[PDB]
Design a binder for this molecule. Structure first.
Ligand SMILES: Nc1nc2c(ncn2[C@@H]2O[C@H](COP(=O)(O)OP(=O)(O)NP(=O)(O)O)[C@@H](O)[C@H]2O)c(=O)[nH]1
Ligand SMILES: [Mg+2]
Length: 164
């Protein structure tokens, strides 16, 4: 099951993955160079879901590679930063990009990350929910830093993956 993480640079794609994989968080920003692969098999009672995590770069110089990264994805996790309006606005085109590559053969989750920065919120949870409904995708808010909703993010995505 190919799961691609997408979104603007510095929204916390890698940190979400690190938190899910290792229950750790690093405050120091280490930009993803193109793509990094990780594997995690989620061991549910009725199925086994070998996740192939495609951690993609949000930096502009890798943008041309994004279509190739989305190719054949079973799931797309589109991440924004709740403190960054631009990052939220850009999620429509990320989700658009997934749709024109995958049509309906993809599970899409819209993630509003960094809820630990509640003081600096620029996008409300209602705005996030609204966009998800408009774009017919799932929605969740997370904090990679605190750990909040990270396990839930991955569990909900995996639950949504079609059986066949
Ligand atoms: N407060 C807070 N900071 C976070 C959170 N998630 C990530 N960060 C911080 O935001 C910065 C970017 O995180 P990172 O995971 O590298 O983002 P990215 O989306 O992978 N960026 P890139 O596209 O360049 O790989 C880092 O300094 C990280 O510590 C979060 O939930 N809360
Ligand atoms: Mg990254």
């Amino acid at each position: 099951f190919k799961l691609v993480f997408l979104g603007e640079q510095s929204v916390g794609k890698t940190s979400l993955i690190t938190r899910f994989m290792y229950d750790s968080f690093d405050n120091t920003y280490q930009a993803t160079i193109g793509i990094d692969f990780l594997s995690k098999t989620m061991y549910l009672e009725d199925r086994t879901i070998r996740l192939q995590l495609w951690d993609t770069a949000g930096q502009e110089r890798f943008r041309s590679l994004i279509p190739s990264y989305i190719r054949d994805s079973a799931a797309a996790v589109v991440v924004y930063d709740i403190t960054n309006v631009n990052s939220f606005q850009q999620t429509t085109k990320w989700i658009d990009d997934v749709r024109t590559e995958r049509g309906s053969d993809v599970i899409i989750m819209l993630v509003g990350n960094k809820t630990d920065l509640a003081d600096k919120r620029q996008v409300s949870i209602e705005e996030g929910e609204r966009k998800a409904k408009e774009l017919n995708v799932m929605f969740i808010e997370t904090s990679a830093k605190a750990g909040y909703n990270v396990k839930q993010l991955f569990r909900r995505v995996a639950a949504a993956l079609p059986g066949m």
